[PDB]
Amino acid sequence: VGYAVLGGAAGFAATALGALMALGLRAISARTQDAMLGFAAGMMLAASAFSLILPGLDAAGTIVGPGPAAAAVVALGLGLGVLLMLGLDYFTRVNRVWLFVLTIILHALPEGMAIGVSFATGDLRIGLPLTSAIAIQAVPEGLAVALALRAVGLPIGRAVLVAVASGLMAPLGALVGVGISSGFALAYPISMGLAAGAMIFVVSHEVHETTATVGLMAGFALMMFLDTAL
Template identity: 35%
Template sequence: MVDYLVELDPVWQALLATLFTWGVTAAGAALVFFTRTVNPRFMDCMLGFAAGVMIAASFWSLLAPGIDMAEQLGQVAWLTAVIGFMSGGIFMRLADRILPHLHPGLGMDKSEGIKTTWQRSTLLVLAITLHNIPEGLAVGVAFGAVAADLPSATLGGALALAIGIGIQNFPEGTAVAMPLRREGMSKRKSFFMGQASGAVEPIGAVIGALFVLNMQSILPYALCFAAGAMIFVVVEELIPESQRQYENIDLVTMATMAGFTIMMMLDVSLG
């Protein structure tokens, strides 16, 4: 399989990788066919685990390679990292402020972004879609970076990032589909809405790969940008959502550490 990927154009590599991550989102949403509820403690642990994966991926797959590339291209590495990382966070803050969305478990009066008359189901999907924008871009940039033929960008590292994002997409699909099912939506429609939240990843990946392939000088900025965007999502949404129940905080914290460890192992071994 890896030999086949090596032969492909980076854009196709990014597309295939994010079709996988979208598929894992769909697998998480498919739980609605088997149950109407998921144990809240288990769900919190899955979200904490996803946060750990994203934190590790942000450093090992994105920020560290971005700093290395900046040095190899003769840029001021720390300045490139600061500009790219903070730009990613600012971009997500603006998107969070503008895009209408609603986090699972909250009432309609807690919806964020521009006020609309959209249905609750649509707002729930958009909340997870907002998570997936930086994830798709990150995978696209990672595969596009491999084409730059710089030592810090490897196909193994890009694959590790895609696998890690795929793993943490499972609870995100569940987090959308399960509340809709509990509210009385049919299994099929709940699944459809849950998996739809991952559809943005292949789009983001293709855009990210095409962008860096045509403007390789901004590669370090793009990698750091993706890292900043992912850290924003973790701190602003995943960690608070996973720790709403105070009695689960220690368990969720260990799940976060487990996610970080697994992603670290993937990236160090494959990258």
């Protein structure tokens, strides 16, 4: 649980840094924003593929067996996660700003949850790549969040403040992750699949298409590297 708390803290720190760069930038081009959001989306997609689905398939493979029951566990967890983020996306001037904040929070939930779930078995080979990747994507997402809050009408100070506070969803999401992943033996792969599907829904809601494609591939590739090296 401690390593997951440190991971969520790294998420909030990265989001805070990216948010603080907006104090100096104030505004950015559409190509830069699309490239950053595509980069983060690719990092999150490949993070769902290689850092959540597959390690959960291995864990359920050692808990249940090599048969299709493990893939059934992970897959059902994934469907439950997609259904969860779908329900959250359905059931939910200054009001528009609040809606933007809510969208940011629901975006940042499955990533903290991904950290906490990934640090359930204590394996650094599972948690470290996903956590580091979530910080690396969290910097441009903090920047884009602050700049987007400034473009809608908030001063750059208020926007950076709301962005830094939006980074607090990663630690809370991590506590939820270790909460749902440490109940029983099957809770770990089910939670891996759940976080994977939740993040796939979020990035599906987050995906000048050429530039965004350059970022998407650029950090899908980055991400495969992080999973291979760590």
